[PDB]
Amino acid sequence: PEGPELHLASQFVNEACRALVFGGCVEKSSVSRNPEVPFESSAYRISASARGKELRLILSPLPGAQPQQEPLALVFRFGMSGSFQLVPREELPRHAHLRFYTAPPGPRLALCFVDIRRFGRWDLGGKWQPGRGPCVLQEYQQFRENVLRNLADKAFDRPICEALLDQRFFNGIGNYLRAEILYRLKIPPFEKARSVLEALQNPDLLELCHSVPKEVVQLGGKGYEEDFAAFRAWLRCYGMPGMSSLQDRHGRTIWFQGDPGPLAP
DNA sequence: CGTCCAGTCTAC
DNA sequence: TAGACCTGGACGG
């Protein structure tokens, strides 16, 4: 999951939990190495917001809910397989690692953080990860300034295709968006990041870092397959017939058309 | 049956 | 840099 999936997941939680009341404890699977969430309330509401490749749940007790409880924030990173589902309480998916349980009246549900591969993480705190840059979807202008004000960073010595995965400057961009972004501008993936960005300061690379992921958000879906067909059809480069692929320095596969670029293996 | 493939995090 | 962290689906023999 990349910024668009985190964004659609936070919309899911807000739409699906809009008229729900949760109650009780926050149950973690016994196999999860993430922290126990110390929260009980007889009546709480769940909402969400996304920032880049992180999502923030707010647990909000209703007026008069017992025990006495302030709102609690949890920040999630999804790794390669995280997601949220709203399921019937006795029909938990495998790998439902964190669960919030509706109170009565009405059918007993569970909102679950589901993560097959368990690369996902959550922290108690509610703070965004120190060091992640602004959200390419929701903080475009801040995101653009943060890159252009710091081209001196050794990060921008690297190929543009690698620079685009560095969550300090491109919070929300991952492996499919870097391929799709670079292909719209026919920028060789192994051009030096500083060269492509100095030449900045007809949409440019930093505008596409916002508008490309925004296109995925507007497709909708992705558990949030018919909806996965829509995505597959949108892709112009990532995994597509007739496209070249190389490994970057960290063993991640960059898809592209044409010139590999000067800094290539 | 097996191999290979799909975002951090941290020990060298 | 390299390996670690995980599960499961696509494929090859």
Author numbering: 2 to 202, 222 to 244, 250 to 290
The authors write:
Human endonuclease VIII-like 1 (hNEIL1) is a bifunctional DNA glycosylase of the Fpg/Nei family, which catalyzes the removal of damaged bases and subsequent incision of the newly generated abasic sites. Unlike traditional enzymes which are commonly referred to as highly specific biocatalysts, one special feature for hNEIL1 is its unique capability to recognize a wide range of substrates, including formamidopyrimidines, hydantoin lesions, oxidized, and dihydro-modified pyrimidine bases, derived from all four canonical bases. Here, by integrating structural, computational, and biochemical investigations, we show that hNEIL1 uses a triage mechanism to achieve broad specificity and reduce futile repair of normal bases. This mechanism involves two mutually competing interaction states: an activated state that commits catalysis and BER, and a quarantine state that temporarily separates and prevents the flipped base from catalysis via auto-inhibition.
We synthesized a 2′-fluoro-substituted stable mimic of DHU (FDHU), which allows binding but not catalysis by hNEIL1. By undergoing a base–acid equilibrium with the adjacent Glu6, K242 can interact with the flipped base as a hydrogen bond acceptor (denoted as “Tau-K2”), forgoing the pre-requisite of the base-tautomerization (“Tau-K1”). Through QM/MM calculations we found that, due to the moderate basicity of K242 (pKa~10), “Tau-K2” is indeed a stable configuration of the activated state in addition to the base-tautomerized “Tau-K1”. Accordingly, K242 is more likely to retain the base in the activated state compared to R242, or in other words, the activated state is more favored by the genomically encoded hNEIL1(K242) compared to its RNA-edited counterpart, which is supported by our QM/MM calculations. Indeed, these two forms of hNEIL1 have been shown to have different glycosylase activities where the unedited hNEIL1(K242) is faster than edited hNEIL1(R242) on several substrates.
